Design a protein around this ligand. Structure first.
Ligand SMILES: CCOC(=O)CN1C(=O)CC(C[C@@H](O)[C@@H]2C[C@@H](C)C[C@H](C)C2=O)CC1=O
Length: 117
């Protein structure tokens, strides 16, 4: 809902929030791993789920085709670890906009869930 949220923010702008423990291994730029991304909005509503295809997102870290927020999240999460990361416009979409209800200062959060490396 509209208002605030208990999420820790970084100096870059992106935020993070523990959702589920893991105790595996933090991904590293250059290595390929499989993770799950859940498109979440500021209100909390989801507008994108990997479930559509039913399969873990496997790709190479620090050398793929994602936004800063994504790389920053994938280069931090650990195998078996699940946590939500707030990806701002300055590190994702930007002030370019992507819709009427999507302002140039709008922020989007995505849930990262490491499956394996
Ligand atoms: C730079 C993107 O980075 C990636 O390469 C991976 N990525 C996308 O391609 C778009 C995703 C979100 C989309 O589903 C929305 C859907 C509506 C809101 C229209 C808008 C233009 C979109 O595209 C977020 C994402 O992480």
């Amino acid at each position: 809902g509209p208002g605030s949220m208990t999420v820790v923010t970084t100096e870059s702008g992106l935020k993070y929030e523990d959702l589920t423990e893991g105790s595996g291994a933090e991904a590293r730029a250059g290595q390929t791993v499989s993770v799950h991304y859940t498109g979440w909005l500021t209100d909390g509503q989801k507008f994108d789920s990997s479930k559509d295809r039913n399969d873990p997102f496997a790709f190479v870290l620090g050398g793929g085709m994602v936004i800063k927020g994504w790389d920053e999240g994938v280069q931090g999460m650990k195998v078996g670890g699940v946590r939500r990361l707030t990806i701002p416009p300055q590190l994702g979409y930007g002030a370019r906009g992507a819709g009427g209800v999507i302002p140039p200062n709008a922020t989007l959060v995505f849930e990262v869930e490491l499956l394996d490396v």
